[PDB]
């Protein structure tokens, strides 16, 4: 995300706001632009657009607005002290205490990003909008999934590009971010997949719309201009002249992964899937014979596997993604 975070985002934000949302941001980026990755994610999908809208509407039906959903389900905004406390408790719970550097920042386009600074893992947490019941989920996403998968993957024959080719691996995504997103909302009482759904939706529209149009369009789902600005930039990462239609479709991966994993949950071995590293749920049978599983780590929330599966059922119910609908969506 560092490469596609516009170098002039602030100056263009002030311009946008000060024009009362009529101006089209003219973004610039650190040269050179990752042309290959831009081209890979230049087209948006609509495969799950009705699921996205289904989730969004389910939230707004129950909570009226996002604003109330956030405050009612998310809990209080956290101080730095409270964040560190929750993180420390989590690391110990996961048995990875002292392995990851934790940093607090205001300039993240997401809640948190797991990185490799100084050839070492770094968890950057956005202090802006960090909330009690939500933060624990972020840690299940970034540490419980991304980090543990990463460490397990480093131990496997397919730990690098060559290894992936040699063993014939499908891409890690959408299985990676699908698993991570399900894990974020795992133990919540109202586990609505708002973030995933709205990202999916925003990209779909971004492909057709200017920035101005996209920003206005989102008003129907979320009022806060700052929140909307985030979603718009994420959807138009890499776009220079945002007056034209176009998107960076990467963030559609979350909902895409969720649907697929939930659809096939009955045949997926979730411990094994995590143990094999950065692998697709489809590659599990292919790679099982060649995986080294002696000292691979499974997240703490997967130990009671019966309960884990119940949570997945609860997540489907909540998000209006019942078995029958998943069945019709993917007749696999
Ligand atoms: Zn992630």
Q: Which residues contact 161 (CB under 8 A, 6 or more apart)?
A: none
Neighbouring C-alpha atoms within 13 Å toward the C-beta of 56: 20
**Residue 77 burial (CB count, 10 A):** 14
- Is 146 annotated to bind a ligand? Reply is yes
C-alpha–C-alpha distance, residues 262 and 186, integer Å: 13
Task: List the catalytic residue out of 142, 176, 323, 325.
Answer: 142
For residue 280 the two structure tokens come to: 């697709």
User: Which two structure tokens, joined as six digits, stand for 41?
Assistant: 């994610």
What is the C-alpha end-to-end distance of the chain, expressed in Å? 33
Please give the helix or strand (H or E) that residue 123 lies within, else none.
strand 120-126
Q: Which domain holds residue 321?
A: 69-172+254-329
240 within domain boundaries: no
Q: Is 237 exposed, middle or buried (0-12, 13-18, 19+ CB in 10 A)?
A: buried
Calculate ∠ Cα 106-251-276, nearest 5°.
Answer: 100
Residues whose CB falls within 8 Å of the CB of residue 171, separated by 6 or more in sequence, listed in order: 280
- Asked how this structure was determined, the answer is X-ray
Residue 181 lies in a domain: no
Specify whether the CB–CB gap between 268 and 186 falls below 8 A: no
For residue 76, is it within any domain? Answer: yes
DSSP structure string for 270-303: HHHHHHT-S--GGGHHHHGGG---TTPPPPGGGS
Q: How many CB atoms lie within 10 A of CB 30?
A: 11
Ligand 1 midpoint to CA 143 (Å): 10
Which residues, 6 or more positions from 170, have their beta carbon under 8 angstroms from its beta carbon? Answer: 279, 280, 282, 283
Q: Which residues sit opposite 105 in a β-bridge?
A: 126
Give the CA distances from residue 23 to residues 14, 238, 241, in Å, rounded to whole numbers and listed in that order: 10, 18, 11
How far is it, in rounded angstroms, from Cα 69 to Cα 122?
A: 30
**300/187 Cα distance (integer angstroms):** 12
Cis (ω within 30 of 0) for the bond into 46? no
Question: Is 141 annotated in some ligand binding site?
Answer: yes
H or E element that contains 94: helix 80-94
57 is in an annotated binding site: no
Computed over its alpha carbons, how large is the radius of gyration of the chain? 20
Helices 225-235 and 9-18: crossing angle in degrees, nearest 10, is 130
Q: What are phi and psi of 269, to 5 degrees?
A: -95, 100
How close is the Cα of 141 to the center of ligand 1, in Å? 6
What is d(CA 236, CA 210) in angstroms, rounded to the nearest whole number?
A: 9
- Characterize the bridge pairing of strands 112-117 and 120-126: antiparallel
Is 142 a known active-site residue?
yes
Q: Which candidate, 131, 244, 152, 151, places its Cα nearest to that of 195?
A: 131
Other residues' Cβ atoms within 10 Å of the Cβ of residue 127: 15
> What's this structure's resolution in Å?
2.5
Count Cα neighbours of 101 within 13 Å in the Cβ-side half-sphere: 9
Q: Look up tokens 């292919």; give the residue.
A: 286
Cβ neighbours of 286 (radius 10 Å): 15
| C-alpha of residue 321 to centroid of ligand 1, in Å | 21
For the chain, count helices (H), then strands (E): 17, 3
The number of residues in the chain equals: 332
Domain count, the chain: 1
Does any domain span residue 102?
yes
CA atoms within 13 A on the CB side of 152: 24
Residue 80 lies in a domain: yes
Cα separation, 185 vs 332, in Å, equals 26
Q: Could you write out the DSSP letters of every residue in 136-191?
A: HHHHHHIIIIIIHHHHHHHTSTTSSHHHHHHHTPPPSTTHHHHHHHHHHTTT-SS-
User: Among positive and negative, which fits the CA dihedral 112, 196, 79, 91?
Assistant: negative
113 part of a folded domain = yes
Alpha-carbon distances of 300 from 122, 145, 276, rounded to whole Å: 20, 11, 16
In a domain, residue 84? The reply is: yes
Residue 26, beta-bridge partner list: 241
| CB neighbour list of residue 314: distance below 8 Å, 6 or more residues apart | 191
The CA 109 to ligand 1 mean position distance, Å, reads 12
Q: In what order do the strands lie in the sheet with 120-126?
A: 101-105, 120-126, 112-117
Residue 153 lies in a domain: yes
CA 15 and chain centroid, separation: 29
Residue 5 has a CB neighbour count (10 Å cut-off) of: 16
Asked whether 262 and 325 are in contact (CB, 8 A), the reply is: no
Element (H, E) at 216: helix 211-217
């Amino acid at each position: 995300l560092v490469a596609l975070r516009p170098t002039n985002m602030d100056r263009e934000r002030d311009k946008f706001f000060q024009s009362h949302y009529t101006y089209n941001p003219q973004f610039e980026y650190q040269e050179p632009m990752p042309t290959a990755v831009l081209e890979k994610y230049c087209e948006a999908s609509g495969q799950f657009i009705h699921q996205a809208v289904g989730i969004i509407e389910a939230v707004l039906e129950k909570f009226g607005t996002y604003e109330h959903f956030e405050a009612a389900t998310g809990g209080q905004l956290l101080t730095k002290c409270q964040i560190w406390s929750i993180v420390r408790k989590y690391m110990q719970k996961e048995g990875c205490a002292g392995e990851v550097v934790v940093q607090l920042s205001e300039d993240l386009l997401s809640q948190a990003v797991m990185m490799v600074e100084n050839s070492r893992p770094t968890l950057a947490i956005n202090l802006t909008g960090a909330r009690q019941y939500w933060l624990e989920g972020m840690l299940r996403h970034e540490i419980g999934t991304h980090y543990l998968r990463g460490v397990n993957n480093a131990r496997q024959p397919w730990h690098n590009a060559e290894g992936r080719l040699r063993y014939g691996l499908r891409p890690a995504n959408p299985t990676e971010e699908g698993l991570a997103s399900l894990h974020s909302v795992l133990f919540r009482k109202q586990p609505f997949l708002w973030r995933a759904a709205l990202l999916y939706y925003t990209i779909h529209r971004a492909a057709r719309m200017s920035f101005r149009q996209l920003f206005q369009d989102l008003e129907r789902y979320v009022q806060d201009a700052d929140v909307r600005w985030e979603y718009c930039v994420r959807a138009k990462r890499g776009q220079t002249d945002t007056s034209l239609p176009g998107c960076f479709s990467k963030d559609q991966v979350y909902l895409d992964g969720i649907v697929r994993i939930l659809r096939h949950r009955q045949t997926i071995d979730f411990p094994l899937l995590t143990s094999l590293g950065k692998v697709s749920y489809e590659d599990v049978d292919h790679l099982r014979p060649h995986g080294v599983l002696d000292n691979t780590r499974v997240p703490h929330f997967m130990q009671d596997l019966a309960r884990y599966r119940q949570q997945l059922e609860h997540i489907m119910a909540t998000n209006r993604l019942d078995e029958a609908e998943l069945g019709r969506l993917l007749p696999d």
